Amino acid sequence: GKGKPRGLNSARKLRVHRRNNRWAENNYKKRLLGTAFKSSPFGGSSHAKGIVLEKLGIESKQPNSAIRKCVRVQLIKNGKKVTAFVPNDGCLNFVD
Amino acid sequence: TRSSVLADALNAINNAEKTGKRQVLIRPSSKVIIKFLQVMQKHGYIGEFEYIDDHRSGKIVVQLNGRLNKCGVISPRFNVKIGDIEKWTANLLPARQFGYVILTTSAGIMDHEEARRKHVSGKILGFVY
Amino acid sequence: PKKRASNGRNKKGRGHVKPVRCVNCSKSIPKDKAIKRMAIRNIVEAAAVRDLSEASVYPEYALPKTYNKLHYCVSCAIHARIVRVRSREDRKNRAPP
Amino acid sequence: MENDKGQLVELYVPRKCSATNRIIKADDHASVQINVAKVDEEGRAIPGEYVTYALSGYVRSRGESDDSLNRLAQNDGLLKNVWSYSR
Amino acid sequence: SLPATFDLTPEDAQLLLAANTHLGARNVQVHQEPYVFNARPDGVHVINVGKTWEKLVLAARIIAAIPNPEDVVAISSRTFGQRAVLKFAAHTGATPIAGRFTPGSFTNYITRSFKEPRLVIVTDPRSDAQAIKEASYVNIPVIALTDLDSPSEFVDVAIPCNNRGKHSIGLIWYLLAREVLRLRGALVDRTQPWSIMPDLYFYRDP
């Protein structure tokens, strides 16, 4: 055999085995455990509002250079602090 | 242990054919095996076959004619509806113009064409082409 | 990958083989894996057979031999050249030289 | 293979091995066609008249071409006691 | 289909038994040679000279069916068969390859080499494995002088005979050439002993 039951009356084992092994997928596990609601500062939402607390110069990883001018932001929704990039040439002068 | 004598017989036939032998011995040669072989022979995929009567389940010597690409069982014997026969033929057969999905129906063991023109269905037994 | 078809030893159907100690360094090696050579050296060759025979009190003494089975670990056998690294195809030659 | 109105629309109906009945593919370069000369009236090896056997590269590679040719020849004549069905 | 004239005659049967053609290999015999007559003690297996003769005549018929005599290539790398194949290619219009086979003679369509035969005859499949391999590459049928332990891979017409004996190899090549000539018409009647003497094919050590 192929290491899985083939019997006409083995549907229970087949579906339970699939259920057990679906936990090894990232997205299925995240969705079924609701990680994005508990973890994930954006509590499962696409966008979030926050208050800039400090400008940061984050050194870029190798093989690059040129620190990236992010901001530390405290979200209104949950109070969690995150770091957010400020993308464009300049555009940190627009954020206070 | 042996769970499908039909699977053993068809596997033996497949191995003999793909090695190019013109004959093959299969044991223990049940009634389902004989009916499957009869469908095969009626459609010309094997030649004459002989039942050797030992006072056990028996043996069968099949004459092969090189026309057999592959014969195999479908295990388990899935229940098949009339509409599902087409899906099974599409999945198992190389083309729509030849090859046969062999079913066990209450009207007897037959190929899928005979099943369709008798308007009967049953459980899937195997295939041949 | 797997360098050797069986393994670098001779143990199929056994499971466990008692070890021996390498004569050179005392490393523990399974007896089936150890490189074993027998030494049958004449008790005095030393370019000295004729001189010992002349000194002998017996005519035609038939001087004896020393017999010693030497077991080497892989490292010591390679280092002392009892065995040599061989090409991939020559490794499969079990015949002695 | 034919279409409607029964005209051969498939090119190159291929040869089949005389021993195993499998198709001799265009790239089967171990396959071999053997002509055995027909013999009339004490020899003379009539030119252009043969019995033809096609053996597939599979049979030749498995080393069964000798026994296969023994059997086919003996069935067609050309051999009196070389091949035995029982063995 | 073969008349009683083609049937084996006692003169060449005596020739074969004297040349020791029937002395097959030891208990080591390939399980693809049913040419084994009942095996005598001391281990040597007796080759059925009748089957050897029938196979030789079939091989001769194939050779005679080849349209151009030059398109038949007779090959020997072993010394015992070099003179045999040279005399074969002399008496018949065959093309000989004695000694080294220069691999790439059937593939590798270049000058100084590259015969393109319609048939290849070898004295030993084991020692002529290179020629057999190339013939398998280019669709060339093979007749081989095969002993009970000779390989049968890509050998279409096996003539079962001793290949350990210079006498046996020379006689088998002699008989093959004689029957090819008889079929061709070079020998008008299949009753004359073919006066050309059956040691001209034998190897010459001194």
Added chain:
Amino acid sequence: GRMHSAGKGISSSAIPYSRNAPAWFKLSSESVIEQIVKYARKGLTPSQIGVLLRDAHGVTQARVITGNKIMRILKSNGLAPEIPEDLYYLIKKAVSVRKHLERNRKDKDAKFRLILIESRIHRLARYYRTVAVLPPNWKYESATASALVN
């Protein structure tokens, strides 16, 4: 094969194709049945009855000669044992192993073999209870196995 081992032995009796008595056999079926009953009264199990019958007599198979199996004949004649012969011998082996084990107490291999033997006993007893050869409440107990084999 070898339910409780890795062995793949195929050695077994190859009974003949002929289902009739051999032409050289002249004893009557009733005579063979009398011999079977005499051996049973002496206390032989069906296996050793058949062994004796084929060895010292000419009866190749009591089934082909008398038309009945030896154990069936014994049951018909009222000589059937309390437990089937194979189960009895399995229990006897289990008893012997258990005695050897309570002696010297360190034969871990004997412990393993006892596990195997009693597993075989329980499977056979389950089959016999299923076909109602044994009572449905029949239970193999190590404390009673010796007293039930003797």
Added chain:
Amino acid sequence: MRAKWRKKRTRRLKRKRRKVRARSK
């Protein structure tokens, strides 16, 4: 770092963590 010695270090860390956990109450 050799996996065996990483294992050793991890075991020591687990023991120390358990000790501190038990020291708390």
Added chain:
Amino acid sequence: GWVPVTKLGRLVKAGKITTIEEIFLHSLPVKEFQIIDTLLPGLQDEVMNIKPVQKQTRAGQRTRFKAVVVVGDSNGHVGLGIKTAKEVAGAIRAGIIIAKLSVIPIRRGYWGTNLGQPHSLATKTTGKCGSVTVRLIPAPRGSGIVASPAVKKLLQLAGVEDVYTQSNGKTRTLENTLKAAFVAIGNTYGFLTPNLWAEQPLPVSPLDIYSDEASAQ
């Protein structure tokens, strides 16, 4: 000119063999690309890709170029050649030659009914090269070639009009994917069918019909 070697090539030049179907029927080894040139004049070539391959040697980066070429006519005949050379143009030329030498026939058929001019494959076929397996499935009329661009180009050069493709393995290994599709195409004439069950009289080779085409006068 050509000045052929390969008596098959001699016959083709002399006009004794006029179709490549005879070569396919007799499984004749083709060694000269001029044979294919004269027997299939309407053979178009496509360069599927050029990729650099590198051999490290003593400052290394030998940096040769490997080209994959598919030739064919959109009726029954396709060939695949892969050649590495020091320059891209040379690789392409030699690959075209190799593909022409490799030209094989494809057995086209009908998905369903028998309405003329086969549009699809006669059977399901599969071909494997490396990890890449390519499966060709007969498709109904109007389906087109459901395949990736390279396999689709190979199939239309072969002459298929309706086919489904399934693939497994590292299909981004284009060389292996094309070789697997080529093997799948070639197996179409190696699959035995009931319409090919009929026994044939085993025709005579042209090398024997015209045997006086290997000599020097």
Added chain:
Amino acid sequence: VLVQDLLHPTAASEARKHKLKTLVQGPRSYFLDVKCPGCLNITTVFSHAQTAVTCESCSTILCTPTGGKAKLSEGTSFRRK
């Protein structure tokens, strides 16, 4: 090979084959009429006897069990039934 008569194997090949591997399995054992030193009966003895068969009306050992075929006590006459 690739062609052989599986329904008609040669007698030599069948005799070479294992008793369970013949076309139809059957015993290779047999029964013998053995002349007991007494009289009134010729004893029937299985070739592969496991029992120390004695005469019906005497007490001489007629065969001795072995791994395979039984022995015959070195004084006896025996016919094969």
Added chain:
Amino acid sequence: GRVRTKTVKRASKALIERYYPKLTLDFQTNKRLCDEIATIQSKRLRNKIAGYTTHLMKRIQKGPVRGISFKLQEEERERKDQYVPEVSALDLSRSNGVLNVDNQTSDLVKSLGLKLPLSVI
């Protein structure tokens, strides 16, 4: 080192291959004949070629060497024409006019040939 290169070895090879009924095993006449029978573009190369030709002549005089095919192909030709003519094809003689075969060989002969002189020992 005085190993002759391929341009000398093959030049001497061809010279000896087509000029054996020609220049002897003496270097002084060998080089003079090479002057006429070959267009060698330097005196040093001509001397090398002539010396190797002389060496090859000297070792040919003690037996043929590999890859040398001059009019040696006429002698070999004759010594290839026979080594036993009208003597004994190891046949019907060297015996009591019989064949010394074995038992199984006698059964083989009795399979078809009723007439063969056999002396099975």
Added chain:
RNA sequence: AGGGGAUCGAAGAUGAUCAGAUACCGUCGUAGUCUUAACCAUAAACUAUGCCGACUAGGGAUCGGGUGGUGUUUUUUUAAUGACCCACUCGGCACCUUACGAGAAAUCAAAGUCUUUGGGUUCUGGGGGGAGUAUGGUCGCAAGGCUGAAACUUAAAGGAAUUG
């Protein structure tokens, strides 16, 4: 925890080497190594290949059993055991050749009979880390074992082979 403790010998003591060398090397040496009565339950516990069943190449050895021989030898008194030789067979540890076939390859008689995909069945994996960690449970005297995440982090990590 008793017994035993010759030898070797985690720790340790020591001489040397060394830039350092409470490392390799040298000399000792505790626990240990052995045993009994209990614990522990883990190893690259490996064939890194679950188990049962069928089929598909060639070959020669070898272990156990069996069969046969005008066999060799061994003596008992015709014969017979034993050992050996030859042939055959079942079962086993393996091996050699070729791979139709399989595979990414190394290689594989299974790792084959798989896109021509289904003989039965158990267990396990789903990119690399974090981590066999945290937490809970359970077992253990302990060392620990079994079960066992996530946050977060990351574009490789990895297998086989090729040329340097």
Added chain:
RNA sequence: AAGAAAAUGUUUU
């Protein structure tokens, strides 16, 4: 028969 010491080399092309 065997033969001491030899640690290190910044980031991105």
